[PDB]
């Protein structure tokens, strides 16, 4: 009832810093592969498995030690990170040619930022900004807008709510987020979201409106030694009602 | 060895064809795939072929030339929710190590019936008096700019869909913190109105 699983989904290391990413898989899947994705040049292979026993070497093997003590699970592991190694790394299975099919299943992907500073992660501020009457009276639409500013890294989830309940039809969130300072490397980033209902579900009174935004950050007892409160994984929202207008 | 991917991001109008090829090196290859991809989500199969000729897939079509050594994907009657990244990938091993492509992002671009294209300022719900402009309902003809200055900040466009409504709508959104901005302002760079 899981399939492949990674965890964890997000993280932020410091460079120099070791990290385990786990992988594991339901499905009694022989064969199972890691891959780095950077946004330029799609999915490489970076260790594969074939059987519980062994491992081998995909393409882009340094950098990276891997396990296949069981079946089940196979843990990729960054024994002192590189920033070039802040990328998308997704785990892959497959029967493995005991069981025919070359179908591979991938795993949701885990996202790592390396930086020079912990001192660089910051959470994301959050607002929501209520529909203008004039798009209300020409269109009979409304739309709500979400800004969440300030953040690095960019290890966001941004959600819309409607009287409790998470929605997905009439949105869009930007695929990208912008940095805040572009020609800067540890530029914190801004995203913003639309929410677009009837004019008639706007002014109505009792309806509640929430973008939520999942930030992941520091954890497990990391140090810090800062004035500002320790930006942690956590959830950040705002909210509004509807307005009779 | 290489497998070789069509650049992108390729913009399609809604109804069209999408089309995204890949050329392999090795003539020996077995098994060819086509891998979707949405933003933030991971790569999912949606094609194989293993033959010379067409495979089909309700909207998609799959076509291998051996003699040519590439595999294409065709979108047929493209939807915006197409809008993805598409991945070729091509067996390697006598145990099917796969060698992927770089991706293609395909943008497929919403058919506006009726624009109404128009700039909004919206009002934060509780933080006294800040600041954001909303442009939106514009066709997908319609160039957004980036009106470089330091501290105005503008999103490129993204497509929204109300299934309640049938309706889409493009839009952009754009701030600053308080330096002399207007909504006036904001959006004009995107390249000539109506």
């Known amino acids: 009832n899981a399939g492949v699983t990674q965890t964890p989904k997000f993280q932020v290391l410091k460079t120099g810093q070791s990290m385990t990413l786990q992988c594991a898989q339901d499905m009694n899947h022989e064969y199972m592969s890691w891959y780095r994705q950077d946004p330029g040049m799609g999915l490489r292979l970076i260790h594969y498995?074939?059987?519980?026993?062994?491992?081998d070497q995909g393409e882009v093997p340094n950098g990276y030690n891997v396990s296949r003590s069981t079946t089940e699970d196979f843990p990729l592991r960054l024994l002192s990170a590189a920033p070039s190694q802040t990328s998308v790394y997704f785990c892959?299975?497959?029967?493995?040619?005991?069981?025919?099919?070359?179908?591979?299943?991938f795993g949701p992907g885990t996202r790592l930022t390396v930086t020079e500073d912990l001192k660089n992660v910051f959470p994301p501020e959050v607002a929501v900004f209520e529909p203008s009457e004039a798009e209300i009276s020409h269109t009979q639409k409304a739309t709500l807008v979400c800004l969440a500013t300030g953040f690095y890294p960019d290890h966001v989830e941004l959600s819309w709510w409607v009287n409790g309940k998470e929605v997905h039809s009439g949105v869009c969130t930007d695929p990208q987020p912008l940095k805040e300072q572009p020609a800067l490397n540890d530029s914190r980033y801004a995203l913003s979201s639309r929410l677009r209902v009837s004019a008639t579900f706007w002014q109505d009174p009792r309806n509640h409106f929430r973008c939520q935004v999942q930030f992941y950050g520091l954890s497990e007892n990391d140090e810090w030694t800062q004035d500002r409160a320790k930006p942690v994984t956590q959830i950040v929202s705002a909210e509004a009602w509807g307005r009779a207008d | 060895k290489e497998v070789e991917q069509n650049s992108g991001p390729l913009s399609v109008p809604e109804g069209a064809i999408a089309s995204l090829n890949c050329t392999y090196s090795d003539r020996g290859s077995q098994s060819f795939f086509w891998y979707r991809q949405y933003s933030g989500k991971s790569p999912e199969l949606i094609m194989s072929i293993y033959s010379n000729g067409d495979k089909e897939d309700g909207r998609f079509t799959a076509q291998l030339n051996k003699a040519s050594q590439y595999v294409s994907l065709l979108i047929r009657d493209s939807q915006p929710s197409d809008s993805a990244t598409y991945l070729c990938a091509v067996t390697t091993d006598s145990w099917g190590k796969l060698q992927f492509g770089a991706g293609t992002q395909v943008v497929v671009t919403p058919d506006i019936q009726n624009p109404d294209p128009a700039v909004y300022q919206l009002r934060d719900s509780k933080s006294s008096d800040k600041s954001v402009c909303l442009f939106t309902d514009f066709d997908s003809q319609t160039n957004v700019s980036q009106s470089k200055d330091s501290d105005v900040y503008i999103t490129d466009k993204c497509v929204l869909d109300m299934r309640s409504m049938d309706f889409k709508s493009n839009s952009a959104v754009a701030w600053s913190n308080k330096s002399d901005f207007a909504c006036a302002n904001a959006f004009n760079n995107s390249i000539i109105p109506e």
């Open positions: 892959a299975s497959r029967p493995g040619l005991a069981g025919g099919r070359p179908e591979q299943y």
């Open positions: 498995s074939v059987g519980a026993g062994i491992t």
